[PDB]
Design an enzyme around this catalytic site. Sequence first.
Site, PDB file in Angstrom:
ATOM      1  N   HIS A 337      38.797 -23.564 -67.665  1.00 33.48           N
ATOM      2  CA  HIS A 337      38.456 -24.278 -66.441  1.00 33.48           C
ATOM      3  C   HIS A 337      37.091 -23.847 -65.918  1.00 33.48           C
ATOM      4  CE1 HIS A 337      39.112 -26.063 -62.401  1.00 33.48           C
ATOM      5  NE2 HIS A 337      38.468 -24.982 -61.999  1.00 33.48           N
ATOM      6  N   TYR A 477      41.562 -30.878 -56.768  1.00 32.84           N
ATOM      7  CA  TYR A 477      42.477 -30.431 -57.812  1.00 32.84           C
ATOM      8  C   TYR A 477      43.571 -31.456 -58.075  1.00 32.84           C
ATOM      9  CZ  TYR A 477      40.081 -26.103 -56.650  1.00 32.84           C
ATOM     10  OH  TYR A 477      39.118 -25.149 -56.408  1.00 32.84           O
TER      11      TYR A 477
HETATM   12 ZN    ZN Z   1      37.240 -25.269 -60.472  1.00 33.49          ZN
END
Ligand code: ZN
Length: 587
Positions: A337, A477
């Site tokens: 990520h 997110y």
């Molecule tokens: Zn991130």
Amino acid sequence: EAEASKFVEEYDRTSQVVWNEYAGANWNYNTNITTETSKILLQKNMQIAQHTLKYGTQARKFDVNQLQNTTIKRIIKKVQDLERAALPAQELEEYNKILLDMETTYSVATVCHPQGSCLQLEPDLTNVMATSRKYEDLLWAWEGWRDKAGRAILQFYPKYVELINQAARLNGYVDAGDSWRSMYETPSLEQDLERLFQELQPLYLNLHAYVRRALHRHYGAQHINLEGPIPAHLLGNMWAQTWSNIYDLVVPFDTTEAMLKQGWTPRRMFKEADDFFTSLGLLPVPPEFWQKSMLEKPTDGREVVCHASAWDFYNGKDFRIKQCTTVNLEDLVVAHHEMGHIQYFMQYKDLPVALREGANPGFHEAIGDVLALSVSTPKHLHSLNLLSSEGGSDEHDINFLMKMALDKIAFIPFSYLVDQWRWRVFDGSITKENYNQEWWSLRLKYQGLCPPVPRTQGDFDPGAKFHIPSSVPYIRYFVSFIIQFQFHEALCQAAGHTGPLHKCDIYQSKEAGQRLATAMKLGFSRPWPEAMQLITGQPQMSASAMLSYFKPLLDWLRTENELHGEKLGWPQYNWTPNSARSEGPLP
Ligand SMILES: [Zn+2]
Ligand SMILES: *[C@@H]1O[C@H](CO[C@@H]2O[C@@H](C)[C@@H](O)[C@@H](O)[C@@H]2O)[C@@H](O[C@@H]2O[C@H](CO)[C@@H](O[C@@H]3O[C@H](CO[C@H]4O[C@H](CO)[C@@H](O)[C@H](O)[C@@H]4O[C@@H]4O[C@H](CO)[C@@H](O)[C@H](O)[C@H]4NC(C)=O)[C@@H](O)[C@H](O[C@H]4O[C@H](CO)[C@@H](O)[C@H](O)[C@@H]4O[C@@H]4O[C@H](CO)[C@@H](O)[C@H](O)[C@H]4NC(C)=O)[C@@H]3O)[C@H](O)[C@H]2NC(C)=O)[C@H](O)[C@H]1NC(C)=O
Ligand SMILES: *[C@@H]1O[C@H](CO)[C@@H](O[C@@H]2O[C@H](CO)[C@@H](O[C@@H]3O[C@H](CO)[C@@H](O)[C@H](O)[C@@H]3O)[C@H](O)[C@H]2NC(C)=O)[C@H](O)[C@H]1NC(C)=O
Ligand SMILES: [Cl-]
Ligand SMILES: [Cl-]
């Protein structure tokens, strides 16, 4: 028009020096929390604000709707937002001090055993939540973290809200949540997110019910109500935001040990991520990255901000990750990520400064996750010798989809509700008198969770979640988890992969690399639907790719839960364990 172009050149040139300065100061505090590093950062906060104030007031003298060039238009609109530099100096000093106090409080909080060791969130408390299978030990960490971190943030948050809203209004927004939502430049954003969430409700409800059933047989009928919410401390994660650490309790039919025994280190984890990007034909991280990054928790007793983060120093050369990396699979995924942020930084480094952003913030969060979907497949993990080879049966597919669902599907309602709460704090419908109450009302509504102990006066459980005291928006997110599957689907189709989507591994796909590169190179120069269409072939956010990925699991869960007579949902929130009878005689 020639004046606007002159302005943009001066802005790009001058901004690089001041933003690089601030990044350096911000890094020196994040990797060494002290009074001196804190003082310097607050200092440089003043400096960067004067630059933002100078060029922002000039940007507001142009009428952008009268500009011909659309690229120059997008740039000047961005520069017109002063963000916190819109606050008067005295208020800005107070606001910056608050942000730092909240960030420091969170990062140095510890939960101590009486007359025993003191545990930090990373790795100690994170490991307890992930590996302990004892109701009381999990409760000790869950309640301990909220007493120390959550309560400690409450005294700052009301004034933080007051000031971040004032800055937003001074930049022309209604409140701070309005300002945040504008990052997606989509008038229909809230409805689009609501519909995406609703499309994933059947899948989440069936996962919730099946996991509830599994917890019921491990922790006992006296602690799990099959028609009510799940206690929030039993899901393997401090915030019950991802559930894959309880895969052992729920699998229908150990990678950490393999990484450790086989010599994986933080630097080898990030190297493996780097190798995956270059297998796609994407950019490797420069030598300066390995020289300056903080990839491990310091061992000299330094206080640091351990929560992983990726850093752009705005000079086209200096990119860093700061992560207190632990050698397990979870953190290997985090490393991917974070390396996706770096890739994005490097891809658009030659764009004008103001356009060096993701197509929208969700895009920035999704890049690394897309690659991690391929790394997590059993085939690829076995190629890394972290798993013994598996046969591609139906039972192994359901097990794998279950594992992936425990993270990806469980996270959907959590990522949705965080900013549902904050948006309503920012617009004034939630005040300090009911911060925690409305937080748990949403935790119940969206996730079907309940607190394992009553929440008392002075609790501020939102404060125990990094992004709240750190003031980092969260809907990015939620968006990331939807679109990363649209990206996975498109890259897999491009790479020639046929068959079930969950068996796809884009490792070595130069076609997938080229497609991601051309999109990342756009930065923020075009509205994000154009980037969406370049990658996927359509311009919308759609949960269909995610639902197609998990289709075999959804079918299996629906049948399993129906035959077991599960009640999907949690109508019974007001239940308790039975009190065992205390029979005499009584000594
Ligand atoms: Zn991130
Ligand atoms: C409105 O304004 C915008 C903005 O202008 C820019 O920004 C403002 C703020 C000011 O600073 C301006 O001074 C500045 O120019 C205008 O947008 C610009 O439009 C021009 C003209 O179309 C573009 O030039 C083309 O760019 C492409 C892409 O090249 C970039 O991206 C590549 C990766 O995608 C990268 O590898 C390149 O190095 C290059 O990178 C860019 O570099 C500049 C300079 O530093 C930088 O400012 C950019 O930020 C940076 N971008 C990125 C993402 O890094 C390029 O392909 C074009 O050249 C091809 O075509 C030529 C013939 O037309 C040919 O001579 C070249 O050799 C090349 O040929 C191709 O080459 C490839 C590979 O070698 C080969 O496969 C092909 O077969 C071959 N094709 C042919 C036919 O031969 C050209 O250079 C600007 O990039 C663009 N800038 C931005 C920021 O978008 C816009 O035009 C204005 N609108 C109006 C109506 O006026
Ligand atoms: C984390 O931050 C602290 C505080 O900002 C840093 O501590 C400081 O480190 C410097 C360099 O070691 C000390 O400088 C001085 O060096 C001269 C000789 O060169 C000496 O005469 C001085 O007495 C002093 O040693 C400085 O005093 C010190 N400050 C404190 C309060 O200890 C620390 O280096 C940082 N840690 C990192 C970057 O890992
Ligand atoms: Cl919580
Ligand atoms: Cl966001």
